[PDB]
Design a binder for this molecule. Structure first.
Ligand SMILES: [Cl-]
Ligand SMILES: [Cl-]
Ligand SMILES: [Cl-]
Lengths: 121, 121, 121
Protein backbone atom coordinates (compact mmCIF):
# COMPACT_ATOMS: atom_id res chain seq x y z
CA UNK A 1 0.00 0.00 0.00
CA UNK A 2 0.96 3.40 -1.15
CA UNK A 3 0.24 6.98 -0.14
CA UNK A 4 0.72 9.92 -2.43
CA UNK A 5 2.41 13.02 -1.09
CA UNK A 6 1.68 16.31 -2.82
CA UNK A 7 3.96 19.27 -2.99
CA UNK A 8 4.05 22.54 -4.87
CA UNK A 9 6.39 25.56 -5.06
CA UNK A 10 6.69 28.68 -7.21
CA UNK A 11 9.65 30.38 -8.85
CA UNK A 12 10.11 33.99 -9.94
CA UNK A 13 11.82 33.23 -13.26
CA UNK A 14 12.10 30.48 -15.87
CA UNK A 15 15.76 29.63 -15.36
CA UNK A 16 17.44 26.36 -14.43
CA UNK A 17 18.98 27.82 -11.32
CA UNK A 18 15.56 28.87 -10.02
CA UNK A 19 13.73 25.71 -11.00
CA UNK A 20 16.41 23.38 -9.69
CA UNK A 21 16.74 25.14 -6.34
CA UNK A 22 13.00 25.21 -5.79
CA UNK A 23 12.64 21.52 -6.69
CA UNK A 24 15.44 20.44 -4.35
CA UNK A 25 13.98 22.50 -1.50
CA UNK A 26 10.46 21.16 -2.02
CA UNK A 27 11.53 17.51 -2.26
CA UNK A 28 13.59 17.65 0.92
CA UNK A 29 10.77 19.39 2.81
CA UNK A 30 8.25 16.77 1.62
CA UNK A 31 10.49 13.98 2.91
CA UNK A 32 11.17 15.74 6.23
CA UNK A 33 7.51 16.59 6.83
CA UNK A 34 6.62 12.91 6.54
CA UNK A 35 9.52 11.44 8.52
CA UNK A 36 10.88 9.51 5.51
CA UNK A 37 14.18 7.84 6.36
CA UNK A 38 15.29 6.52 2.98
CA UNK A 39 14.69 7.19 -0.68
CA UNK A 40 13.98 3.44 -0.80
CA UNK A 41 10.54 4.27 0.62
CA UNK A 42 9.65 6.07 -2.61
CA UNK A 43 7.95 3.98 -5.31
CA UNK A 44 8.25 6.84 -7.84
CA UNK A 45 7.97 10.64 -8.06
CA UNK A 46 5.95 12.47 -10.71
CA UNK A 47 6.39 16.18 -11.44
CA UNK A 48 4.39 18.71 -13.36
CA UNK A 49 5.42 22.17 -14.49
CA UNK A 50 3.25 25.00 -15.77
CA UNK A 51 3.62 25.98 -19.44
CA UNK A 52 5.61 29.08 -18.48
CA UNK A 53 8.50 26.90 -17.20
CA UNK A 54 10.53 25.22 -19.97
CA UNK A 55 14.12 25.88 -19.03
CA UNK A 56 14.78 22.77 -16.92
CA UNK A 57 13.70 19.24 -15.99
CA UNK A 58 12.64 18.89 -12.32
CA UNK A 59 14.06 15.33 -12.47
CA UNK A 60 17.54 16.80 -13.03
CA UNK A 61 17.15 18.65 -9.71
CA UNK A 62 16.02 15.47 -8.03
CA UNK A 63 19.24 13.83 -9.29
CA UNK A 64 21.25 16.70 -7.74
CA UNK A 65 20.02 15.38 -4.40
CA UNK A 66 20.76 11.81 -5.48
CA UNK A 67 17.43 10.47 -6.72
CA UNK A 68 19.10 8.39 -9.47
CA UNK A 69 17.56 5.19 -8.11
CA UNK A 70 14.10 6.72 -7.62
CA UNK A 71 11.98 6.44 -10.79
CA UNK A 72 11.00 9.95 -11.92
CA UNK A 73 8.62 11.29 -14.57
CA UNK A 74 7.59 14.80 -15.59
CA UNK A 75 4.72 16.33 -17.49
CA UNK A 76 3.06 19.67 -18.27
CA UNK A 77 0.17 21.10 -16.17
CA UNK A 78 -3.15 22.43 -17.59
CA UNK A 79 -2.85 26.23 -18.40
CA UNK A 80 -6.05 27.39 -16.69
CA UNK A 81 -6.77 31.15 -17.04
CA UNK A 82 -5.97 33.05 -13.89
CA UNK A 83 -4.16 30.15 -12.28
CA UNK A 84 -0.90 30.58 -10.45
CA UNK A 85 2.13 31.06 -12.72
CA UNK A 86 5.45 29.25 -12.58
CA UNK A 87 4.50 26.29 -10.39
CA UNK A 88 6.44 23.05 -9.90
CA UNK A 89 4.12 20.33 -8.58
CA UNK A 90 5.25 17.03 -7.11
CA UNK A 91 3.36 13.72 -6.52
CA UNK A 92 5.59 11.33 -4.55
CA UNK A 93 4.29 7.75 -4.31
CA UNK A 94 5.32 6.54 -0.83
CA UNK A 95 5.35 2.89 0.28
CA UNK A 96 3.90 3.28 3.77
CA UNK A 97 0.98 2.23 5.95
CA UNK A 98 0.62 5.83 7.23
CA UNK A 99 -3.05 6.78 7.39
CA UNK A 100 -4.29 9.18 4.76
CA UNK A 101 -4.92 11.94 7.32
CA UNK A 102 -1.39 11.65 8.72
CA UNK A 103 0.34 12.28 5.35
CA UNK A 104 1.66 15.84 5.19
CA UNK A 105 1.37 17.77 1.94
CA UNK A 106 3.80 20.70 1.39
CA UNK A 107 2.93 23.94 -0.41
CA UNK A 108 5.69 26.55 -0.43
CA UNK A 109 6.10 30.20 -1.45
CA UNK A 110 3.12 31.46 -3.44
CA UNK A 111 1.89 27.89 -3.93
CA UNK A 112 0.29 28.12 -0.52
CA UNK A 113 -2.47 30.01 -2.42
CA UNK A 114 -3.40 26.79 -4.21
CA UNK A 115 -4.57 25.07 -1.03
CA UNK A 116 -5.99 27.39 1.60
CA UNK A 117 -7.49 24.36 3.32
CA UNK A 118 -4.00 23.25 4.28
CA UNK A 119 -3.51 26.42 6.33
CA UNK A 120 -4.56 25.77 9.81
CA UNK A 121 -5.34 27.40 13.02
CA UNK B 1 -0.28 -3.61 -3.76
CA UNK B 2 -2.08 -1.23 -5.96
CA UNK B 3 -4.50 -1.41 -8.87
CA UNK B 4 -5.06 1.42 -11.28
CA UNK B 5 -8.61 2.30 -12.26
CA UNK B 6 -9.12 4.07 -15.56
CA UNK B 7 -11.94 6.40 -16.40
CA UNK B 8 -12.77 8.78 -19.21
CA UNK B 9 -15.62 11.17 -20.06
CA UNK B 10 -16.30 13.83 -22.69
CA UNK B 11 -17.78 17.31 -22.48
CA UNK B 12 -19.49 19.41 -25.14
CA UNK B 13 -17.81 22.71 -24.23
CA UNK B 14 -14.67 24.07 -22.56
CA UNK B 15 -16.31 25.65 -19.54
CA UNK B 16 -15.77 25.04 -15.83
CA UNK B 17 -19.37 24.05 -15.28
CA UNK B 18 -19.10 21.32 -17.92
CA UNK B 19 -15.67 20.07 -16.90
CA UNK B 20 -16.43 20.05 -13.20
CA UNK B 21 -19.75 18.23 -13.57
CA UNK B 22 -18.26 15.59 -15.84
CA UNK B 23 -15.31 15.01 -13.49
CA UNK B 24 -17.53 14.65 -10.42
CA UNK B 25 -19.81 12.20 -12.25
CA UNK B 26 -16.93 10.10 -13.55
CA UNK B 27 -15.12 9.91 -10.20
CA UNK B 28 -18.22 8.80 -8.32
CA UNK B 29 -19.03 6.18 -10.96
CA UNK B 30 -15.47 4.82 -10.83
CA UNK B 31 -15.72 4.43 -7.06
CA UNK B 32 -19.19 2.84 -7.23
CA UNK B 33 -18.25 0.43 -10.02
CA UNK B 34 -15.41 -0.92 -7.87
CA UNK B 35 -17.22 -1.08 -4.53
CA UNK B 36 -14.86 1.45 -2.89
CA UNK B 37 -16.04 2.34 0.61
CA UNK B 38 -13.69 5.17 1.55
CA UNK B 39 -11.50 7.73 -0.14
CA UNK B 40 -8.83 6.35 2.21
CA UNK B 41 -8.49 3.45 -0.25
CA UNK B 42 -7.10 5.84 -2.87
CA UNK B 43 -3.32 6.25 -2.95
CA UNK B 44 -3.60 9.13 -5.47
CA UNK B 45 -5.60 10.19 -8.55
CA UNK B 46 -4.03 11.48 -11.76
CA UNK B 47 -6.01 13.32 -14.43
CA UNK B 48 -5.33 14.27 -17.99
CA UNK B 49 -7.22 16.70 -20.20
CA UNK B 50 -7.02 17.14 -23.95
CA UNK B 51 -5.50 20.39 -25.27
CA UNK B 52 -8.96 21.73 -26.14
CA UNK B 53 -9.89 21.90 -22.42
CA UNK B 54 -8.17 24.72 -20.51
CA UNK B 55 -10.95 26.36 -18.55
CA UNK B 56 -10.74 24.31 -15.34
CA UNK B 57 -8.66 21.98 -13.17
CA UNK B 58 -10.21 18.49 -12.75
CA UNK B 59 -8.70 18.46 -9.23
CA UNK B 60 -10.97 21.38 -8.29
CA UNK B 61 -13.96 19.18 -9.19
CA UNK B 62 -12.54 16.36 -7.14
CA UNK B 63 -12.37 18.78 -4.18
CA UNK B 64 -16.07 19.63 -4.74
CA UNK B 65 -16.75 16.02 -3.77
CA UNK B 66 -14.31 16.27 -0.87
CA UNK B 67 -11.07 14.83 -2.22
CA UNK B 68 -8.93 17.30 -0.23
CA UNK B 69 -7.10 14.47 1.51
CA UNK B 70 -6.59 12.44 -1.69
CA UNK B 71 -3.38 13.47 -3.49
CA UNK B 72 -4.29 14.71 -6.99
CA UNK B 73 -2.25 15.63 -10.06
CA UNK B 74 -3.20 16.76 -13.56
CA UNK B 75 -1.49 16.89 -16.91
CA UNK B 76 -2.17 17.41 -20.63
CA UNK B 77 -2.89 14.50 -23.04
CA UNK B 78 -1.14 13.94 -26.42
CA UNK B 79 -3.07 15.79 -29.26
CA UNK B 80 -3.24 12.91 -31.75
CA UNK B 81 -4.91 13.79 -35.09
CA UNK B 82 -8.41 12.45 -35.33
CA UNK B 83 -8.58 11.52 -31.67
CA UNK B 84 -11.62 12.23 -29.55
CA UNK B 85 -12.00 15.89 -28.53
CA UNK B 86 -12.66 17.27 -25.07
CA UNK B 87 -11.79 14.23 -22.95
CA UNK B 88 -11.12 14.12 -19.21
CA UNK B 89 -9.15 10.98 -18.33
CA UNK B 90 -8.66 9.63 -14.82
CA UNK B 91 -6.10 7.13 -13.39
CA UNK B 92 -7.02 6.33 -9.77
CA UNK B 93 -4.37 4.36 -7.85
CA UNK B 94 -6.34 2.04 -5.53
CA UNK B 95 -4.86 0.21 -2.53
CA UNK B 96 -6.55 -3.17 -2.95
CA UNK B 97 -5.82 -6.85 -3.51
CA UNK B 98 -8.60 -7.02 -6.15
CA UNK B 99 -7.43 -9.08 -9.12
CA UNK B 100 -6.61 -7.18 -12.27
CA UNK B 101 -9.55 -8.71 -14.17
CA UNK B 102 -12.01 -7.72 -11.44
CA UNK B 103 -11.15 -3.98 -11.58
CA UNK B 104 -13.84 -2.07 -13.46
CA UNK B 105 -12.82 0.73 -15.80
CA UNK B 106 -15.45 3.42 -16.61
CA UNK B 107 -15.84 5.15 -19.98
CA UNK B 108 -18.76 7.56 -20.21
CA UNK B 109 -20.52 9.59 -22.92
CA UNK B 110 -18.54 9.64 -26.16
CA UNK B 111 -15.48 8.27 -24.37
CA UNK B 112 -16.95 4.81 -24.79
CA UNK B 113 -15.51 5.11 -28.34
CA UNK B 114 -12.00 4.99 -26.90
CA UNK B 115 -12.37 1.42 -25.64
CA UNK B 116 -14.69 -0.75 -27.68
CA UNK B 117 -13.21 -3.78 -25.97
CA UNK B 118 -14.89 -2.71 -22.75
CA UNK B 119 -18.32 -3.07 -24.37
CA UNK B 120 -19.57 -6.49 -23.77
CA UNK B 121 -22.17 -8.90 -24.77
CA UNK C 1 4.38 -1.98 -2.05
CA UNK C 2 5.23 -0.74 -5.45
CA UNK C 3 8.36 -0.07 -7.46
CA UNK C 4 8.46 2.19 -10.46
CA UNK C 5 10.31 1.04 -13.55
CA UNK C 6 11.57 3.70 -15.93
CA UNK C 7 12.11 3.28 -19.62
CA UNK C 8 12.86 5.55 -22.54
CA UNK C 9 13.38 5.14 -26.30
CA UNK C 10 13.77 7.45 -29.30
CA UNK C 11 12.29 7.38 -32.78
CA UNK C 12 13.55 8.93 -36.01
CA UNK C 13 10.17 10.18 -37.24
CA UNK C 14 6.74 11.20 -35.93
CA UNK C 15 4.73 8.39 -37.47
CA UNK C 16 2.50 5.77 -35.87
CA UNK C 17 4.54 2.92 -37.24
CA UNK C 18 7.70 4.29 -35.61
CA UNK C 19 6.10 5.24 -32.31
CA UNK C 20 4.18 2.00 -31.95
CA UNK C 21 7.16 -0.22 -32.74
CA UNK C 22 9.42 1.63 -30.33
CA UNK C 23 6.82 1.49 -27.54
CA UNK C 24 6.23 -2.24 -27.97
CA UNK C 25 9.97 -2.93 -27.97
CA UNK C 26 10.61 -0.81 -24.88
CA UNK C 27 7.73 -2.29 -22.87
CA UNK C 28 8.76 -5.88 -23.56
CA UNK C 29 12.39 -5.11 -22.68
CA UNK C 30 11.34 -3.45 -19.41
CA UNK C 31 9.35 -6.53 -18.44
CA UNK C 32 12.14 -8.93 -19.45
CA UNK C 33 14.86 -6.96 -17.66
CA UNK C 34 12.90 -7.23 -14.41
CA UNK C 35 11.81 -10.87 -14.69
CA UNK C 36 8.09 -9.97 -14.75
CA UNK C 37 5.97 -13.05 -15.38
CA UNK C 38 2.51 -11.55 -15.83
CA UNK C 39 0.93 -8.26 -16.76
CA UNK C 40 -1.05 -8.79 -13.54
CA UNK C 41 2.06 -7.56 -11.70
CA UNK C 42 1.57 -4.10 -13.20
CA UNK C 43 -0.52 -1.64 -11.17
CA UNK C 44 -0.52 0.87 -14.06
CA UNK C 45 1.76 2.27 -16.78
CA UNK C 46 2.21 5.98 -17.47
CA UNK C 47 3.77 7.30 -20.68
CA UNK C 48 5.09 10.65 -21.75
CA UNK C 49 5.96 11.84 -25.23
CA UNK C 50 7.94 14.89 -26.27
CA UNK C 51 6.05 17.71 -28.04
CA UNK C 52 7.52 16.66 -31.40
CA UNK C 53 5.57 13.36 -31.29
CA UNK C 54 1.82 13.75 -31.92
CA UNK C 55 1.00 11.07 -34.45
CA UNK C 56 0.12 8.22 -32.07
CA UNK C 57 -0.88 7.19 -28.54
CA UNK C 58 1.72 4.97 -26.81
CA UNK C 59 -1.22 3.24 -25.06
CA UNK C 60 -2.42 1.98 -28.46
CA UNK C 61 0.96 0.25 -28.88
CA UNK C 62 0.65 -1.23 -25.42
CA UNK C 63 -2.73 -2.67 -26.48
CA UNK C 64 -1.04 -4.23 -29.55
CA UNK C 65 0.86 -6.37 -27.05
CA UNK C 66 -2.32 -7.01 -25.07
CA UNK C 67 -2.24 -4.46 -22.27
CA UNK C 68 -6.04 -3.97 -22.36
CA UNK C 69 -6.34 -4.96 -18.70
CA UNK C 70 -3.38 -2.83 -17.57
CA UNK C 71 -4.47 0.74 -16.74
CA UNK C 72 -2.58 3.16 -19.01
CA UNK C 73 -2.23 6.94 -19.10
CA UNK C 74 -0.24 9.31 -21.31
CA UNK C 75 0.92 12.88 -21.09
CA UNK C 76 3.27 15.40 -22.72
CA UNK C 77 6.88 15.96 -21.51
CA UNK C 78 8.46 19.38 -20.75
CA UNK C 79 10.09 20.87 -23.96
CA UNK C 80 13.45 21.83 -22.45
CA UNK C 81 15.85 23.57 -24.89
CA UNK C 82 18.56 21.27 -26.12
CA UNK C 83 16.91 18.17 -24.73
CA UNK C 84 16.68 14.96 -26.69
CA UNK C 85 14.04 14.98 -29.45
CA UNK C 86 11.38 12.38 -30.13
CA UNK C 87 11.44 10.47 -26.84
CA UNK C 88 8.83 8.03 -25.51
CA UNK C 89 9.18 7.68 -21.73
CA UNK C 90 7.55 4.97 -19.65
CA UNK C 91 6.87 4.74 -15.86
CA UNK C 92 5.55 1.26 -15.03
CA UNK C 93 4.20 0.86 -11.49
CA UNK C 94 5.13 -2.71 -10.46
CA UNK C 95 3.61 -4.58 -7.50
CA UNK C 96 6.74 -6.22 -6.11
CA UNK C 97 8.94 -6.40 -3.03
CA UNK C 98 12.08 -6.14 -5.21
CA UNK C 99 14.59 -3.79 -3.59
CA UNK C 100 15.00 -0.41 -5.20
CA UNK C 101 18.57 -1.18 -6.30
CA UNK C 102 17.51 -4.42 -7.98
CA UNK C 103 14.93 -2.76 -10.28
CA UNK C 104 16.30 -2.43 -13.81
CA UNK C 105 15.58 0.72 -15.79
CA UNK C 106 15.78 0.50 -19.62
CA UNK C 107 17.04 3.27 -21.90
CA UNK C 108 17.21 2.36 -25.58
CA UNK C 109 18.57 3.90 -28.80
CA UNK C 110 19.57 7.53 -28.31
CA UNK C 111 17.74 7.65 -24.98
CA UNK C 112 20.81 6.11 -23.40
CA UNK C 113 22.13 9.72 -23.51
CA UNK C 114 19.55 10.72 -20.91
CA UNK C 115 21.08 8.55 -18.19
CA UNK C 116 24.83 8.08 -18.46
CA UNK C 117 24.83 6.84 -14.88
CA UNK C 118 23.02 3.72 -16.02
CA UNK C 119 25.96 2.77 -18.25
CA UNK C 120 28.26 0.61 -16.33
CA UNK C 121 31.63 -0.88 -16.36
CL1 LIG D 1 -1.46 17.89 5.36
CL1 LIG E 1 -13.61 -3.50 -16.91
CL1 LIG F 1 19.19 -0.11 -13.35
Amino acid sequence: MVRGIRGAITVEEDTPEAIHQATRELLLKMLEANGIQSYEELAAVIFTVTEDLTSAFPAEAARQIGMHRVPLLSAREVPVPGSLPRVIRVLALWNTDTPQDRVRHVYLREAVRLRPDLESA
